[PDB]
Amino acid sequence: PMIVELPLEKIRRPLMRTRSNDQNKVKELMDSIRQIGLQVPIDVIEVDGTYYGFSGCHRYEAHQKLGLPTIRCKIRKGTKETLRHHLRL
């Protein structure tokens, strides 16, 4: 697993419907990343040449509200089942 800087516009976020993000943690992470940068890269799954992200909601929102183009990611080659497992009620 190689850490890659992926643009924010390429990570599909299917769980944005459940975006109960506390702006306090978001702003704390914004300040910390603006200080020392992102330390824990988010988890991204590649399926059929498309990137999906289910964790790292606060970090993603912080990168968005900080005006940063890319974010560090640890990409895992995934299948249709691990993509379907995350999309199961």
Ligand X SMILES: Nc1ncnc2c1ncn2[C@@H]1O[C@H](COP(=O)(O)OP(=O)(O)O)[C@@H](O)[C@H]1O
Amino acid found at 19: R
The nearest distance, CB 20 to ligand X, in angstroms, is 11
Q: For residues 12 and 52, what is the distance between their CA atoms, to the nearest angstrom?
A: 5
Sign of the CA dihedral running 60, 55, 44, 35: positive
Nearer Cβ to ligand X (50/55): 55
Site string for ligand X, 7-46 (x = CB under 6 A): ------------------x---x--xx--xxxxx------
Region from 1-9, 11-19, 53-61, 81-89 binding ligand X, contact rule CB under 6 A: 53-61
Between helix 57-65 and helix 23-36 the angle, nearest 10°, is: 70
**Cα→Cα distances 5→22, 54, 85, Å:** 25, 17, 26
Query: Quick one: 45 or 57, whose CB is closer to ligand X?
Result: 57
Residue 56 as a binder of ligand X (CB under 6 A): the answer is yes
Specify the residue, 9 or 24, whose C-beta has the smaller distance to ligand X.
24
